Structure 1
Amino acid sequence: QDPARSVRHIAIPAHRGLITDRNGEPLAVSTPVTTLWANPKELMTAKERWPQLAAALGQDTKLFADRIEQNAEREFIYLVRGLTPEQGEGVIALKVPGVYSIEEFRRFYPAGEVVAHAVGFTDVDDRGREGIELAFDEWLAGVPGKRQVLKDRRGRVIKDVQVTKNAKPGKTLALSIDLRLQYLAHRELRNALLENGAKAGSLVIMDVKTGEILAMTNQPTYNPNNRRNLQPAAMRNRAMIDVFEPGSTVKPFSMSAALASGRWKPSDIVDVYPGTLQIGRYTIRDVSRNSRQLDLTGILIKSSNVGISKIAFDIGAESIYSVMQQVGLGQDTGLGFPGERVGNLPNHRKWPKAETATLAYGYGLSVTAIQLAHAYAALANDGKSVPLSMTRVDRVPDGVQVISPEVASTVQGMLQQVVEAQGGVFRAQVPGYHAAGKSGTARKVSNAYRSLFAGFAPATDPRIAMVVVIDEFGGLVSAPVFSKVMAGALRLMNVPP
């Protein structure tokens, strides 16, 4: 026969670490719940109690009985996971032979759908499945404790002996996210999509000094506290996953290369008439074909593919490739979100004219909204790249001077004119401030199109970079979202006009 006595162990679940926004507002909080397990060999001696027990578990009387009878020979099954402590005390109070309790934890997300994708959620075992919860699982999970029990020959717990290992609570995490900006971003992105008959999009706000992600919102979203009817479209962290050719939004990086080459100055003129350029069997065609001479700022205002291609042929694709690589386009973000997409910044030894031109006007690479906001942050931060962070930054990293301060300042002033000049993206203007940026028609890589707006403010002393992505010309839907969210974000951060 089996031993009359055996010393056994039971795990002591650990309290998962608090997630807060950068101002300490809670975003994910461990809620005590009660798990009930049974020894069927003991339960089998108390059948008349089963229907009361089943009703207190919210289980069907016969399905409950069938489950215990089917497991009669086992000494452990779970009865139910994650009752309220009040509910568990009610079941324990029934004193049914063979019913035992374990203290577990369930997450609650106080801000719900507003920050669903960035924070993520946990599975039935309280482990990270999505977002920060996944990326920082090890940090947040802590370490289960251990205690000894004495069991008899039939698996009855006859003594709680001792705790041999204290549970180690998980560690607290303060995100870079500012929930005030996050609520503004979520509201305005949602409202823009509903008003324009669009289904999906994303918005990223970054601190250009610190590399902090201040807001990251995607539509559709979901309530992480009630996933009962959750659609896969809604769980997608689009800002980090959706890859697209960024089109005209990377022409500022092409212009940065041109101004670093020694061959170009802002007052330089390019003739783009008649809005096309034959390069062998290929024709580069401009979206607006009403121009002859354009200065470098006008090439950005008109988004002339011919203009930027002629510059690119003069300076060589390798100069443009290098800037785009150094500002992080097509590169690992280092954020350690499993499944984050890197996109592709193709390289060549010999760049033919076609591939040189498509790189320079943004169809020769694929990026995410995070990478595009990161690149805009570098340009805004007087050309100094700072690592991306989803966590609060107290000591700002040195970062890397990727674009000379002078060139970055000149390109800031060109992008100010894109927003402010006659013929510019006037819907991206931010009353009280100089804003700077560039619209684009992005092409999805998996043709599906996205309306992009990328920019920063204040134009003459930048603090915040922003990318707006609307899945669906001239930012007519993404530019006004930038305008409204930047207007708000700057004042919530007490940025002076």
Structure 2
Amino acid sequence: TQAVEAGEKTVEQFVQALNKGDYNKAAEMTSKKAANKSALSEKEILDKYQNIYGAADVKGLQISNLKVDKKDDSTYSFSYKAKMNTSLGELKDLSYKGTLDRNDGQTTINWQPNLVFPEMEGNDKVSLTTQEAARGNIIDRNGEPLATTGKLKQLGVVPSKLGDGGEKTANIKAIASSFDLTEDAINQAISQSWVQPDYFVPLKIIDGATPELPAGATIQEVDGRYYPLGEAAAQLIGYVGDITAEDIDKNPELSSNGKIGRSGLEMAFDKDLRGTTGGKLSITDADGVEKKVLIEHEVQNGKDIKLTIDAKAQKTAFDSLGGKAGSTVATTPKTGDLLALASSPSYDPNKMTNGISQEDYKAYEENPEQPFISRFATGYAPGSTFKMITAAIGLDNGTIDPNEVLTINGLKWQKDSSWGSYQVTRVSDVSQVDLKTALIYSDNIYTAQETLKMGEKKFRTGLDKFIFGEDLDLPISMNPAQISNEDSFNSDILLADTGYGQGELLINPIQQAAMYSVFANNGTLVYPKLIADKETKDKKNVIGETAVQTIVPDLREVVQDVNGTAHSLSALGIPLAAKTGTAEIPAPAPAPGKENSFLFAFNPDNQGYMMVSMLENKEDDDSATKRASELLQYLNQNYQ
């Protein structure tokens, strides 16, 4: 019975070729054209599958429940069931028939129409009508639009209504001087390869008032994706682009005429936002008369998505960065609601999703400050803000006495002579330094000595209670925060640097706002939350409640004391508990070192808001504390 063994392989070899998209190789393992064999030629079957399976974007043909027999001398009948994925979802429970033929020694298939779809017969045709689904909206915690689809005023020119010569050059200089467009770019689009003398060539997108129209300038209304806050949330929201042929080859349930998320939340939530395509896939007669319907369902528009983001806080946080490199994260620390996730510099998502030049796109990628980076998801060394956690660990294990006063002389210190030339450095030469004094002046030497006194085992014991190595349940690509490169410092120097927020620490701004939430929840860490409806998740007993009641009053003095590093914030007249930081980054080539300014601040009275702002590669005299007054006033007013 070794004949049925070769027959099951012939059917298996045929389905694989169809599944692999190679229709020619599938057509070669069929029999010759005859009434008792195949119904079409090899090149005729190739065009049959390519036209039909291609029009429906058939992908992932897989079979099951195969049964091969032997009816006559060389007529071995076979049957199975199959399923496939098309533009309108999955087509399951398909009953296929057909027969085989094993003359000579090879088992060829007697091809028939019913090997394309179960009920195909002779010269039956296939039709596919689809209704595209509208993309869902992205909204803030109060329903404000962050990413919607709407009507736009598109500026464009037609070469015929421009004129002939001289008069045509004058309007090109007139259209360029009325819509903020380059005079050398109007002809760059008029003289493209696709242009004809009467076509409507697009130009710029008017995002407000429609000015006067020179000779040969029409504004047509076309619908497209629109981002109200613009660059203020471009990294977080992202942008959508035209769907390509390879996008369909990867997921046929898309829409060749639709838009797909290319970055940010538009890409992370692409499935829930794009919806599902409607329409029907049916088999018709030889004359086009509908015979059998294969797939059909209504068009379902995309779901809206409500974020915890405050649209007003998002814009204020971004604008406060003045276009400099940095990022700001604002939360309601008791719940974890991410109120703002700003990153600067940024790109224009409206220009990105509508029409953008290869020149402006190259300016974004070749910009050294890298406007495409989501800096709120980029790991940094936390700097001196991390002293709050090193101190709280020292209070939890009894290593740090808040009233114990260390005697530090000078601006440099080392454990012993084995450290060589390296020394911990502080900025203020305060002789008598206790915990409160250390947090006010941000004393690295106090922090380094208390860290070395604590020891690595006790230090990591307190550190592991946080979220180092954890993957936050957020729709944002990020790497987990890390304490060091390996599970052991293996260096007293690296142990000290980690104490005051340097060393090999890597914590992104979002993870910092999560780790620092303990000081607004009596030692309970509250995980951040971006989706409004999602349930609040927390982590009990990260630090002791005694340490919180000890450090938070000291953090008030970082603002209120005359020599506090955040004393400029006392001008606000609002209850503030803050901690500043300026992390130093080593330079590759012999170049001046780069510095990163940091600011942590929250309301110690009502715990209504908490923020963590930073500047990457800060300019001189620039800082995050310098720019925080406006956002702090808003968060204190609206989030209590």
Shorter chain as normaliser: what TM range? Answer: 0.7 to 0.9
- Counterpart of 1:226 in 2: which secondary structure? helix
- 1:289-308 alignment runs, 5 A limit: 289-308=428-447
Mapped contact 1:212–1:393 kept (Cα < 8 A): no
The reply on whether 1:13 has 2:139 as its aligned counterpart is: no
In structure 2, C-alpha distance between the alignment counterparts of 1:492 and 1:475, rounded to whole Å: 30
- 1:130-279 alignment runs, 5 A limit: 130-148=263-281, 164-190=296-322, 193=323, 199-227=324-352, 228=356, 229-230=360-361, 231-232=364-365, 233-241=370-378, 243-279=379-415
1:353 is displaced (CA, Å) by 1.6
In structure 1, C-alpha distance between the alignment counterparts of 2:147 and 2:292, rounded to whole Å: 34
Could you say if the C-alpha distance between residues 437 and 393 of structure 1 is closer, same or farther in structure 2, counting changes exceeding 3 Å?
A: farther
Q: Which range moves more in the overlay, 2-11 or 289-298?
A: 2-11
Map of 1:368 onto structure 2: 508
- Counterpart of 2:395 in 1: which secondary structure? helix
In structure 2, C-alpha distance between the alignment counterparts of 1:157 and 1:29, rounded to whole Å: 40
- Counterpart of 1:355 in 2: which secondary structure? helix
| Structure of greater relative contact order (alpha carbons < 8 Å, 6+ residues apart) | 1
In structure 1, C-alpha distance between the alignment counterparts of 2:425 and 2:291, rounded to whole Å: 78
In structure 1, C-alpha distance between the alignment counterparts of 2:301 and 2:260, rounded to whole Å: 14
Q: CA offsets per residue over residues 423-442 of structure 1, 9 Å max, x none? A: 10212336232211211112
Q: TM-score, normalised by structure 2?
A: 0.60
Map of 1:488 onto structure 2: 634
- Counterpart of 1:396 in 2: which secondary structure? coil
Q: CA offsets per residue over residues 351-399 of structure 1, 9 Å max, x none? A: 5321210110111211211112222223222221112111115743344
- 1:93-108 alignment runs, 5 A limit: 106-108=224-226
What amino acid is the match of 1:7? V
What amino acid is the match of 1:130? S
In structure 1, C-alpha distance between the alignment counterparts of 2:569 and 2:425, rounded to whole Å: 22
In structure 1, C-alpha distance between the alignment counterparts of 2:465 and 2:297, rounded to whole Å: 48
Q: CA offsets per residue over residues 285-317 of structure 1, 9 Å max, x none? A: 323251222011111222222211111122223
- Which structure's CA Rg is the greater one? 2
1:345 aligned residue (470, 483, 506): 483
The reply on whether 1:354 has 2:499 as its aligned counterpart is: no
2:577 aligned residue (408, 432, 436): 436
Aligned residue-pair number: 423
Mapped contact 2:527–2:538 kept (Cα < 8 A): no
1:483 is displaced (CA, Å) by 2.7
In structure 2, C-alpha distance between the alignment counterparts of 1:353 and 1:251, rounded to whole Å: 17
In structure 2, C-alpha distance between the alignment counterparts of 1:319 and 1:383, rounded to whole Å: 18
1:275 is displaced (CA, Å) by 3.0
The reply on whether 1:397 has 2:540 as its aligned counterpart is: no
Map of 1:468 onto structure 2: 613
In structure 2, C-alpha distance between the alignment counterparts of 1:488 and 1:62, rounded to whole Å: 52
In structure 1, C-alpha distance between the alignment counterparts of 2:284 and 2:399, rounded to whole Å: 83
Mapped contact 1:441–1:473 kept (Cα < 8 A): no
1:415 is displaced (CA, Å) by 1.2
Q: CA offsets per residue over residues 6-59 of structure 1, 9 Å max, x none? A: 1133444322222110001121123489xxxxxxxxxxxxxxxxxxxxxxxx99
Q: TM-score, normalised by structure 1?
A: 0.76
The reply on whether 1:414 has 2:551 as its aligned counterpart is: no
- Counterpart of 2:473 in 1: which secondary structure? coil
Could you say if the C-alpha distance between residues 380 and 250 of structure 1 is closer, same or farther in structure 2, counting changes exceeding 3 Å?
A: same
1:451 is displaced (CA, Å) by 1.0
What amino acid is the match of 1:317? E
In structure 1, C-alpha distance between the alignment counterparts of 2:571 and 2:298, rounded to whole Å: 55
What amino acid is the match of 2:377? M
In structure 2, C-alpha distance between the alignment counterparts of 1:309 and 1:473, rounded to whole Å: 27
Could you say if the C-alpha distance between residues 379 and 284 of structure 1 is closer, same or farther in structure 2, counting changes exceeding 3 Å?
A: farther
The reply on whether 1:382 has 2:522 as its aligned counterpart is: yes
Mapped contact 2:419–2:493 kept (Cα < 8 A): no
In structure 1, C-alpha distance between the alignment counterparts of 2:332 and 2:372, rounded to whole Å: 26
1:160 is displaced (CA, Å) by 12
Could you say if the C-alpha distance between residues 388 and 31 of structure 1 is closer, same or farther in structure 2, counting changes exceeding 3 Å?
A: same
Map of 2:237 onto structure 1: 119
1:60 is displaced (CA, Å) by 8.2
Q: CA offsets per residue over residues 116-171 of structure 1, 9 Å max, x none? A: 22211112132222221122222223222342367899xx9998997712233222
In structure 1, C-alpha distance between the alignment counterparts of 2:311 and 2:413, rounded to whole Å: 48
1:259 is displaced (CA, Å) by 0.6
Q: CA offsets per residue over residues 311-368 of structure 1, 9 Å max, x none? A: 1122223333344443335643331323x23343225457532121011011121121
Could you say if the C-alpha distance between residues 294 and 330 of structure 1 is closer, same or farther in structure 2, counting changes exceeding 3 Å?
A: farther
In structure 2, C-alpha distance between the alignment counterparts of 1:152 and 1:202, rounded to whole Å: 62
Mapped contact 2:381–2:501 kept (Cα < 8 A): yes
In structure 1, C-alpha distance between the alignment counterparts of 2:225 and 2:464, rounded to whole Å: 39
- Counterpart of 2:440 in 1: which secondary structure? helix
Q: Which range moves more in the overlay, 110-119 or 161-170?
A: 161-170
In structure 2, C-alpha distance between the alignment counterparts of 1:385 and 1:305, rounded to whole Å: 25
Give aligned-pair identity as a percent: 25
- 1:272-287 alignment runs, 5 A limit: 272-279=408-415, 280-282=418-420, 283-287=422-426
1:467 is displaced (CA, Å) by 1.3
Could you say if the C-alpha distance between residues 122 and 318 of structure 1 is closer, same or farther in structure 2, counting changes exceeding 3 Å?
A: farther
Could you say if the C-alpha distance between residues 63 and 409 of structure 1 is closer, same or farther in structure 2, counting changes exceeding 3 Å?
A: same
Task: Give unpaired runs (5+ residues) of structure 2.
Answer: 1-43, 49-121, 153-188, 206-221, 244-258
Mapped contact 1:376–1:456 kept (Cα < 8 A): no
Map of 1:24 onto structure 2: 143
In structure 2, C-alpha distance between the alignment counterparts of 1:468 and 1:235, rounded to whole Å: 18
Task: Give unpaired runs (5+ residues) of structure 1.
Answer: 34-57, 66-79, 85-103, 194-198
1:479 is displaced (CA, Å) by 0.7
Q: CA offsets per residue over residues 157-216 of structure 1, 9 Å max, x none? A: 9989977122332222100101121122122222xx5xxxxx311111111011111011
